[model samples]
Target: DKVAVKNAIRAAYRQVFERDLEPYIINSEFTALESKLSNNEINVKEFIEGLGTSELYMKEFYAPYPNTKVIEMGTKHFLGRAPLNQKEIQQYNQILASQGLKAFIGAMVNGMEYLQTFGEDTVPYRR
Candidate 1:
């Protein structure tokens, strides 16, 4: 059971990060998180947020996308929805201009759809 849970957690990391979670190739933070996950200390939602907000995710996913592309990607990734309408795009664009990228991402990740889809019990995956 513990092994299954660990595998699921590692698989979530792989799906979200688009790569494998090799024990030797990756650092100890991943191993430590695996321990927490296998021990039932952290649920899948926490694990997703942990890796999603990490520096690697920021660099690889967030930094590479343009502002508009980031908003579109965030919509699909967090809410399982398509790109916003023109009006919605303008609104979020202004929010990005005023609030900054972190806040913009926070708003999307904390949306009701995201909460409903993953909750605390489930991990996010491509939908």
Candidate 2:
């Protein structure tokens, strides 16, 4: 069977963040984002992007974490695999250094791996 929006939602949250969003207010906002996704107002790529840039995601995934950790986690989340090598990590680090969070998330969701692996509908999974 294909990945339904229901399972995809849960898997998306789990795979990307390693935690679920709670009933907090900001989660309510994220819940709305999920609603849009479920209703097909946005594709999976956008939903993943939204998840990546959400407040809690940014704080926990990017802000306090060092560049290597951030990129490591981000690549796993958005690209669904480990970064290729030291040079790949370094390249991602430089992108983060110059472009910051939105750009970093944008790059991840927009990367060639993401395009080929997950595309618009499929949730990013280990590839």
Candidate 3:
């Protein structure tokens, strides 16, 4: 089930970063982050890659911890580079409120929603 879970996590990122969190992309910030990542200026490959990998499930980490700005910053960088649509923008905010949902299974339900939207190429494995 690791593959399934991995797929779901990847889908969540694509959903949140590619679709919903797009409009918030900023040019200056994105370029800066890319320079760091590309040149290995930041040693935390696992952390950065993890962010890229688990976009939605990471929401749970962000919602409660909310310490790292990397997620938002990453979304800003990529979205600015890639043109997007209105529906994708809407999905960003909708997923922002994806915490605690309505019932106790909010996290689980949100996870399913994220996984359901994934496709063969939707997961953020690499380029």
Candidate 4:
């Protein structure tokens, strides 16, 4: 059970950012998040979102991609699908323009689709 959870966490990181978290896998924040999941203190949505906003993630992904690319990646990583329409893309652009990267990710990970798809215990995966 613990192994599955840990594997799921690692999978989420790899899928979301295309990076291995092996170096920081044992870091306090990561372990804390794992503990949170075990204790039901956080859900799968929060867990993945936390990773997306971490300094590691920001440095690796946010710095490389502009706002538009960030929106696209977020959709792919969190929703497991490409954005459906230009209006949706524009809406994400507006959020990125107004809010910034963390907020943009917050909106993405908190969407109803994200919640319905991954929820608390389900491991995040591609469509």
Candidate 5:
């Protein structure tokens, strides 16, 4: 039974990981400079347009398992801003459609804020 459970977890993890990476291009990086854009008064429409062209991915990166803790994490994460890119929004939309769930997902770079939730002056989660 333990083996079954372990195997199930591994399988689910693999699925989620694969699905999450599905949209990212090979060897891409996620660089979101909030202060740079926010301070510059970046145009929202053009910013979104430029975001669509990046080799960066999304589908597999920003989603939770069908029904799991990741869902809670995602809800809190997304509510905290706008989608990183349109691809991300579409990816979440697909996940929602698959799960028969309804939620609005957008992203903004609240990386600092996200970390602050853990503790004061916490750093963003970047590798």
Candidate 6:
């Protein structure tokens, strides 16, 4: 049971940051999300959501890229899959461009696909 939570945390760091361990927590504003998860205050879904929308993630993934490219990587980061089609990319692009980063992350994590694949406890992994 303990491994479940610990493994999920590491897996999230791997997926969201493409790193094996989270070395950026001290430099991130969203350390509170990890604290919340550690205290049983939030689910893996929310924790991953928080990481996806953090300032560092923005600087690394979203800010330095074109909108078209972020959709490709952002979906993989939060949902562990690529956009299914150009239509899907169009929708996600709209969300990112219109509502901004947090909304896109929120929409990704709250989707039926995300919930069905990872639910509340499991980390996002490739499907």
lDDT of 4 by residue, 1-127 (tens): 7777777777877887776666555484577887887677887778888887777777767789887677777788878788888899998888878977787788767777877887756656778
Candidate 6 lDDT over 32-53, as tens digits, reads 8767788899999989888877
For the record, the alpha-carbon RMSD of candidate 5 to the native fold, in angstroms, is 14.6
* Model 1 Cα lDDT, one tens digit per residue, 31-120: 666677778898766666666556666676778988777677656545556665977777778877897765666665666777887786
The root-mean-square deviation over C-alpha atoms between each candidate and the true structure, in angstroms, is 3.0, 2.3, 13.4, 2.0, 14.6, 1.8
Which residue pairs clash in candidate 3?
Answer: 13-55, 20-92, 25-76
Residue 99 CA displacement from its true place in model 4, Å: 1.4
Lowest lDDT 10-residue stretch of candidate 4: 20-29
Q: Write the per-residue lDDT of candidate 5 for residues 44-122, one digit (tens) a residue.
A: 2222222222223134333425433334334333233344555755666666567533232222222334334422112
lDDT (tens digit, per residue) of candidate 3 on 84-112: 34454444435454532222122212244
- Model 3 has an lDDT value of 0.36
The clash numbers for all candidates, in the given order, read 0, 0, 3, 0, 10, 0
- Best-first order by TM-score: 6, 2, 4, 1, 5, 3
Backbone clash pairs for candidate 6 read none
Predicted model with the maximum TM-score: 6
Q: Tell me the spans in candidate 2 whose CA falls farther than 4 Å from its real position.
A: 1-3, 25-28
Better candidate by TM-score, 1 or 2: 2
List runs of model 3 lying over 4 Å from the truth: 1-45, 49-74, 78-83, 100-127
* Position 47, candidate 6: lDDT: 90
Stretches off by above 4 angstroms in model 1 are: 86-102
* Rank ordering of all candidates by lDDT, starting from the highest: 6, 2, 4, 1, 3, 5
